[PDB]
Amino acid sequence: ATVLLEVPFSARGDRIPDAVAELRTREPIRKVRTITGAEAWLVSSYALCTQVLEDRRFSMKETAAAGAPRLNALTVPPEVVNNMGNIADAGLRKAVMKAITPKAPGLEQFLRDTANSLLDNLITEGAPADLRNDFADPLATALHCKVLGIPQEDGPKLFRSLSIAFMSSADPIPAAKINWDRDIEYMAGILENPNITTGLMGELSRLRKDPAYSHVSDELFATIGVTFFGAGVISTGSFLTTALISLIQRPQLRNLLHEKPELIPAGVEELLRINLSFADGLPRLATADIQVGDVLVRKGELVLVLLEGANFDPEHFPNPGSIELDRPNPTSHLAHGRGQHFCPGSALGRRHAQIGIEALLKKMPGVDLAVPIDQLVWRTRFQRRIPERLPVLW
Amino acid sequence: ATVLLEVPFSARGDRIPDAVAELRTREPIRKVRTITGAEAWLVSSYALCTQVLEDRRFSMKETAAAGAPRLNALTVPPEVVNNMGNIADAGLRKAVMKAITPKAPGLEQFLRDTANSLLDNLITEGAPADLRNDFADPLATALHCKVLGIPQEDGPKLFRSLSIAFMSSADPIPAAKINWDRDIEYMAGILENPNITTGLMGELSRLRKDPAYSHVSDELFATIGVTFFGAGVISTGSFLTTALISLIQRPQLRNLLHEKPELIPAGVEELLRINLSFADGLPRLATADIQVGDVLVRKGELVLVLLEGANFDPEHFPNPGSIELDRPNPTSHLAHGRGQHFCPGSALGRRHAQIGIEALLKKMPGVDLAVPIDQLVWRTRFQRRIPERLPVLW
Ligand code: HEM
Numbered sequence: 023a024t025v026l027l028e029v030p031f032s033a034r035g036d037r038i039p040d041a042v043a044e045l046r047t048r049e050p051i052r053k054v055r056t057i058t059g060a061e062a063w064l065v066s067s068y069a070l071c072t073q074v075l076e077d078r079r080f081s082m083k084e085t086a087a088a089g090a091p092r093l094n095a096l097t098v099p100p101e102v103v104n105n106m107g108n109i110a111d112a113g114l115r116k117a118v119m120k121a122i123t124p125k126a127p128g129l130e131q132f133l134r135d136t137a138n139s140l141l142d143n144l145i146t147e148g149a150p151a152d153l154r155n156d157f158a159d160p161l162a163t164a165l166h167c168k169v170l171g172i173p174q175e176d177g178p179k180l181f182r183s184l185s186i187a188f189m190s191s192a193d194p195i196p197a198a199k200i201n202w203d204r205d206i207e208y209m210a211g212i213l214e215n216p217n218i219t220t221g222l223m224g225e226l227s228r229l230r231k232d233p234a235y236s237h238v239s240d241e242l243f244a245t246i247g248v249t250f251f252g253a254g255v256i257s258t259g260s261f262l263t264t265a266l267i268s269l270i271q272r273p274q275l276r277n278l279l280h281e282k283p284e285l286i287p288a289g290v291e292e293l294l295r296i297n298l299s300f301a302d303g304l305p306r307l308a309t310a311d312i313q314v315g316d317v318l319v320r321k322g323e324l325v326l327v328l329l330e331g332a333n334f335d336p337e338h339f340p341n342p343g344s345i346e347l348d349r350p351n352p353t354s355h356l357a358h359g360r361g362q363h364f365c366p367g368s369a370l371g372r373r374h375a376q377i378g379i380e381a382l383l384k385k386m387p388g389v390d391l392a393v394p395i396d397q398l399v400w401r402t403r404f405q406r407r408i409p410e411r412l413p414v415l416w
Numbered sequence: 417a418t419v420l421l422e423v424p425f426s427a428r429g430d431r432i433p434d435a436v437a438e439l440r441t442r443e444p445i446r447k448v449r450t451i452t453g454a455e456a457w458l459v460s461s462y463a464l465c466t467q468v469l470e471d472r473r474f475s476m477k478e479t480a481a482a483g484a485p486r487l488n489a490l491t492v493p494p495e496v497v498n499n500m501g502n503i504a505d506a507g508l509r510k511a512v513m514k515a516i517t518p519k520a521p522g523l524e525q526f527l528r529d530t531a532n533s534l535l536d537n538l539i540t541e542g543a544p545a546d547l548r549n550d551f552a553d554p555l556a557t558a559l560h561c562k563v564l565g566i567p568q569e570d571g572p573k574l575f576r577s578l579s580i581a582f583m584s585s586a587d588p589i590p591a592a593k594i595n596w597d598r599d600i601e602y603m604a605g606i607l608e609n610p611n612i613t614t615g616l617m618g619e620l621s622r623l624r625k626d627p628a629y630s631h632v633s634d635e636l637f638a639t640i641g642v643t644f645f646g647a648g649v650i651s652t653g654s655f656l657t658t659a660l661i662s663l664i665q666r667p668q669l670r671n672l673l674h675e676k677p678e679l680i681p682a683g684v685e686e687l688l689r690i691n692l693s694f695a696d697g698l699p700r701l702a703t704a705d706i707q708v709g710d711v712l713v714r715k716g717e718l719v720l721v722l723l724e725g726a727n728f729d730p731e732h733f734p735n736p737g738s739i740e741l742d743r744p745n746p747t748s749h750l751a752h753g754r755g756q757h758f759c760p761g762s763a764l765g766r767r768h769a770q771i772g773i774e775a776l777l778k779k780m781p782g783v784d785l786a787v788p789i790d791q792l793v794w795r796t797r798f799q800r801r802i803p804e805r806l807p808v809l810w
């Protein structure tokens with residue numbers, strides 16, 4: 023007698039478990055138990071992952087319903103799970119999306135200067151350096167302060183909520199509520215701060231006093247600040263970190279990108295595709311009875327869309343484990359999801375990674391791990407897979 | 417077909433695995449495979465642990481022999497494994513041991529002021545607080561700078577070597593050598609620094625120019641600084657952290673110690689006894705064929721002395737999982753080892769814990785975890801078990 027298969031399989035973000043391919047072949051939708059004890063359907067083929075993400079009857083919003091089977095505990099108010107819907111309903115969709123493009127004047131140069139300044143300080147200090155805590159995450163944090171229009175010096179305390187805010191927990195987390203409420207108060211103060219005129223918060227500040235948005239709540243405006251900061255910083259910092267591992271472990275690739283940096287966009291797209299940053303399947307709740315492969319998913323059941331399931335599917339991406347800069351379908355991966363909830367920061371994230379890698383390869387062309395790869399400490403019960411420290415030398 | 421049982425069993429430092437008791441009953445010496453692929457004998461009963469630690473033919477020094485079966489890779493020069501022997505041979509044993517007592521004038525008050533100042537800053541900043549990174553470890557770090565006679569401001573960079581120096585790795589760690597050599601150069605500079613006149617380094621500085629120690633190497637003096645700083649900081653910071661978890665999880669105990677703080681020494685002794693801080697058995701290499709329980713250990717074989725094996729042995733400590741402040745045999749645990757290599761900092765460590773707990777209970781009598789216990793991220797492939805962050809509220 024064995025128990026029902028448990029998810030997630032491994033918190034290690036540097037390699038995919040052999041088990042994923044075996045499951046995809048045998049049972050590309052199959053029943054699993056989450057950390058809460060809930061049952062769920064784990065979907066692991068490209069075809070079935072795409073089907074679920076593209077069918078809105080597999081609802082994100084309804085995952086927050088009281089009494090639903092849960093992947094993990096809410097770390098935000100239940101109405102905040104439908105944040106993008108709330109944004110759209112408030113007529114704020116176009117403005118939010120415009121404010122988080124990497125195309126804003128000066129932004130890319132700010133990114134490059136910031137990356138270069140972080141790297142110079144590591145160089146000055148001498149190897150070993152921690153590329154997560156002292157490069158990737160600070161770069162992510164600086165980027166999102168600039169994108170939000172908020173002071174850089176406020177970034178670190180906001181950042182420090184995230185090790186808790188993005189926990190994947192069986193039970194509610196008291197600290198998450200403390201940090202949430204505090205971070206909300208900060209963003210509400212920002213909207214009242216006349217010095218804040220640029221970026222997302224500057225724009226929301228103005229829209230908040232525009233008559234065309236008079237009956238949009240202050241709660242929604244502050245929520246947008248907290249959610250976009252947290253999602254952006256955690257996602258870009260975590261992605262860049264694990265992409266750096268994948269690069270460092272492929273010196274031939276590292277050298278080619280150092281040699282031909284115009285291939286970096288193609289490289290970052292592949293690093294996105296193979297990225298194991300998302301620790302859990304994307305949760306959705308069936309709002310109807312829906313056939314998914316050989317399984318009739320019943321209304322009220324939880325479905326988990328395993329991103330690496332899709333992204334390493336050899337039917338869609340032949341030789342899935344190899345980075346190939348000339349695939350015919352390079353952006354057709356699901357690293358930024360798909361459908362209604364496709365990542366609004368995908369371009370900004372792509373650019374954070376491109377610029378951080380560009381700068382790292384220039385300043386540290388000899389970059390290598392300073393510890394054997396198995397020594398990396400992978401964060402557990404978290405919504406991302408990340409090494410606690412990423413020690414490198416150069 | 418199963419593989420040979422692997423060690424360590426779990427990096428979780430908040431509970432002992434049920435498997436340890438089962439093993440102790442069934443097979444209190446049994447064969448296991450280490451992370452290097454080496455075979456070893458894992459010893460898990462009080463009686464057999466004590467036998468091994470008290471028989472010097474189970475050698476610490478010989479664990480460093482080229483070609484021996486290894487628990488993990490050396491992170492120091494092989495001659496440094498015999499550091500205490502080297503100390504004794506150089507006539508430095510009495511001086512080193514005297515310099516690391518908690519009885520030095522002002523030391524306890526420095527500890528208390530430092531603990532109180534760390535706590536006030538957490539209070540000012542507001543919950544949640546990380547009791548590992550922003551209390552236990554800084555307290556350990558400050559204590560050891562003061563004990564060594566070195567500037568407090570030098571503590572943080574020395575501290576940052578330790579996440580690597582105390583790795584438990586299958587392979588040599590390049591960063592460990594970088595940090596070792598750098599930290600050695602620092603301690604050599606300290607011995608040449610005329611401002612350094614107090615503590616262990618002040619005393620070694622003087623003995624280095626005393627004719628009675630003329631043919632003791634500069635290498636040994638600097639090595640003593642690096643080894644005593646690292647072992648002391650890692651051991652006291654890690655112990656206090658996990659003792660804090662054990663306390664916090666027992667509010668009745670926490671309240672009693674807050675109420676009757678004179679029971680704190682008895683409490684710290686029990687917290688020592690149940691402490692899971694050591695991630696691996698203590699390694700020893702047989703220098704002869706020696707009968708240990710039902711096993712004839714052969715010369716050249718590795719033996720691992722599982723401290724919690726001894727310390728949770730119900731034959732020696734009845735109701736082993738319960739903290740009892742009135743045991744008849746309270747200091748007979750093996751938390752500081754036993755025999756030739758008994759911890760030279762045991763009193764200093766006891767006092768760090770007592771004072772840190774005293775101060776925490778006074779400043780934060782309402783101290784509780786701010787996250788569910790399962791959310792703590794336990795450091796892997798490391799010589800200690802420690803949570804990466806210890807989020808608390810009060
Ligand atoms: C490489 C970097 C990034 C990756 C891999 C990533 C990944 C993802 C994925 C997979 C989703 C889909 C969630 C779902 O469908 O259940 C998503 C949505 C989202 N992302 Fe990203 N993201 C990245 C960067 C960013 C940035 C920079 C921001 C903000 C500045 C951001 C903000 C959001 C938000 C607010 C959502 C929710 C969308 C919705 O519910 O409609 N992301 N992201």
Ligand code: HEM
Binds near residue numbers: 500644647693760
């Ligand atoms: C609660 C705190 C502490 C614990 C639990 C602890 C634990 C231990 C243990 C189990 C050993 C035996 C190693 C073996 O036999 O293989 C040991 C030895 C040692 N400890 Fe500690 N220790 C603590 C505090 C300290 C401090 C504060 C220092 C230095 C300032 C220190 C320095 C050393 C050294 C240098 C050895 C090697 C002894 C030898 O090889 O003869 N320890 N410790």
